Chain length 160, copies 8
């Protein structure tokens, strides 16, 4: 019932990307919350969200942002929980600004960063699942089944 | 006098760069404070610094950071004062990470960004001076003199 | 009545970007002028515009250009006023040439640079407003209201 | 105690970087193993290491590589454990090749990627610690202390 | 009859690119097989494919992948045969991630890398043909004819 | 003799690079002047230099600058003479900023751009020589000799 | 009558870009030839074209190419004439491969390089005109008129 | 014996890199020649070298160049032999110019491209060896031994 993963993003425009994280957590039956938290437009909301996350029972935060993408890193500054960052693709620089803004954190405050775009959102959810599976045997079984099906679904040759 | 510019940086390792901003403000006799404020390692210190800057009488904030450089942008999130950002040169990516994480602010929260490195630190101080000069005539004259000396001192041929 | 901000750009093609600066100054009731000044095709026009800006009562110049983008920097060479630069997105290099051409000024002649594209134009106007607000209490109040409304308009969760 | 984190790297030349991960895990008293596993030069060693990691009791793998950096991704292909990737700074391209070859994993096989270089190695260890802390209360308290000391130790002004 | 070149790729999406290699081998009458082998989703399939390639009679492997593109390099780790790599164009980073992931192999395990995209696929097939032509005189003649026709087909001036 | 090529650069720090252009013109006995002209620090000096270049008898201008490198383009704005641009290697971005700010001129005002660094300075001088050689037969013969010696002097094997 | 500028390019696909050079030379009444010369597919044609250019009366060569763009540099290797290079925009890398392939010539063999794309083609023609104008007074007058009209045609403000 | 691989490079400055290809071919006892051939400074030497390579009995050409690196591609234009390209690390752009000017060959004339720098030179020699091994059984066995020793010699832990 109570959420164990928080998915956060700075804008509705980020949802086109972050929806892939939401869908995968739901597929794996991982209770979660999905919210908008804007690092620059709602910085006090961010501080409160991140600093209370652990006491609220969250175990992992998945944060997506694009451009000068500060949401994952500032989240990580305020929580001891693992924070996973999804670089959202930007218009001009194709997410390279997003990527460098998120992955290049200073020693002492980590953000586990995934690929630019939808792939990264899906993989943030899978990485969160991998973390939770360490201490949830039922989920561990669901995740192993999921990975096995992924492997079995790969064809032997292309449709030419 | 009470400071009217705050120079802030995330680490002692930024000082090699940000000292150029400090020196310039001193040269132009602009009262200022020079502090370490770490966006990631001291986020509550940052929130407090930025949100109280205006009531403390600061007029401009100069913020320097390298890598995933969030200090200028998060400062701007908490203050209506103009915030000027200095990308510090990072070891691997030579400040390109610094530059993009500072300049690419989405619309609604600006950071006026200067060049990577020492040039950017000097120019953040000069840009702060040009802002203050709009409503301080004595400083405006000192800034005019500074720019005039810069122009007049350029040699005509290389040695 | 008399303009206190000048918005300048090198071409009509730049207007698609710089119109966002114009609109925001108008929203905040900041008197301004909006002109075409081409660094390469009208260099004497630029010299005259920049060197007379202060005596004409301008307080801030917002300059946009793309490609080998020299308009903001050459403006700054000729005026003591703060100059803010907007990198206009270019076709091949997506504004990276614009950005580096504008932001990498030598020590001694500053240009306060904003994001590539529309975001940068909007933020140049907001930064200009922040500067003017230091010595205009009515504008300072309008700007604080504007920022507060921005913060209040952020939803708590995405439309899924 | 039996290791719960494996730190692996493709070469001795990566050790200058990955030693920072090793030191951090030691500081936090997290039992770990530190090994060379080369994706290209010892691919069967990699397959064996990754596929048996869970049954050996590992909880997290930290993998560092430079250049065409395939070690973290291929590790993740063979294990359901979380795999954290450290891009090692390469000579010519300063770790940009390392970074893109690690972080740009297609959907379905994740690698949580940290910064280029020593910062990334330290942060992979801290991220592993934060994962383990979710279900080890004594470690969680030591990690809290570590983060608190980091925050409290930041000076207020540069020297 | 029996294949002497293997063309492998990680996904059906790669076929839009790798089909150009397949077509050129067919044009030059080089027997080959075309398969899907996913480095990350079917890593045991890859190990088996690469380690048995020589004993199965393959002489050259052409491998295409995009993004964090590991298929060519991991193939090369498991075979003594020459491995040629085709960087498939990726959405955000335009194949620059593909290119660097493939070409920047450590000393000791080579991948001969071709251009991003369709050009690279065509050239991987031509390079494979060049290799086989060293010890197949009939193919050597076909390849020389092919190159000669290419040269003769270049017009002297553009259609204006 | 009166100069027919002007070599200009924004700073003494550019001289390490631009000296290669100066040396080449001297070697080919092309009368020239070598000057500092700063686009940002001495913009009126630049306008005057460029607008009077043709009437002073200059035929080609070689302009070198680093960073936000505006000197070649603004020179070309004020003269119909051919302007050749040398991107000087900058500290952080290794001349990539220099290169893009010089070469990406919009249509209507050209700058013929050479390689980043010393190679580009040498080649700007050679390109200027090849322009002058079109209407100076003695120089054309000296340039032929120079290119012939370059070709003939390449060794057949490394030492 | 006889051509004094040669415009060369490696493919018909380059014409979309190089046509802007052709049009400007025609506008300025500069006699020229426009040809296809492929560095990689017709290397002997290139050697012959470049090594005979001066004796044929050419004064400037404008060469365009994209990707691994070798046509301008190899032209310059074989002629003492000034060679101007136009980087043609490539699909994946947006002409950055074209640009670096052309501009980064070794000391001793120059190529005067212009902008990526149509702007560069137009400017190669203008630069060629500037060179020819040094020893053709009538053209010098036409070029000064052209530049003056360019300056006079810049509006004072945008259409908003 | 008569050479079956030609190693060519544009300058003595490339030798620091290309010596790694030479050493590897020597180690595997592959008869080869090692020469300077400059695409821009000696274009007729290049045309002659490439067009006669096959009739001279060469089987593979390894070509190294930096900057605007045209040597491998122009070699491939004149021969049907496989041409392998080594991007030499350039001073300013760290071989990114070298890499793009070699690898981005349009369809119809291939160059098999290796990594920037010494790794690429070593790997061009190994790739040439793997090509030759297809039809030389003694060499194939020596190459098997070489790869086996590489794999077996990787240490299990860092020192
Ligand atoms: O890890 P240290 O050296 O303290 O800081 C290195 C970089 O991390 C950033 O926060 C600072 O702005 C600095 O540029
Ligand atoms: O060639 P050596 O120095 O062994 O290794 C250099 C790089 O090759 C990669 O596999 C390693 O991760 C390292 O970063
Ligand atoms: O600040 P200094 O060292 O004078 O000049 C550094 C760079 O600033 C540019 O104007 C010059 O062309 C030079 O490349
Ligand atoms: O100017 P030098 O040092 O002779 O050569 C430097 C670069 O120019 C290229 O042709 C060579 O391949 C080398 O990488």
């Amino acid at each position: 019932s109570a959420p164990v993963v928080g998915i956060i993003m700075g804008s509705q425009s980020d949802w086109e990307t972050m929806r892939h994280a939401d869908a995968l957590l739901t597929e794996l039956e991982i209770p979660h919350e999905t919210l908008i938290v804007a690092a620059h437009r709602t910085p006090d909301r961010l501080a409160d969200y991140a600093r209370t996350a652990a006491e609220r029972g969250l175990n992992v935060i998945i944060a997506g942002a694009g451009g000068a993408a500060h949401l994952p890193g500032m989240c990580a500054a305020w929580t001891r929980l693992p924070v996973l960052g999804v670089p959202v693709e930007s218009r001009a620089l194709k997410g390279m600004d997003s990527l460098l803004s998120i992955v290049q954190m200073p020693g002492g405050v980590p953000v586990g960063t995934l690929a630019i775009g939808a792939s990264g959102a899906k993989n943030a959810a899978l990485l969160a699942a991998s973390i939770l599976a360490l201490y949830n045997p039922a989920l561990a079984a669901r995740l192993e089944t999921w990975r096995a099906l992924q492997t079995a679904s790969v064809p032997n040759s292309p449709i030419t």
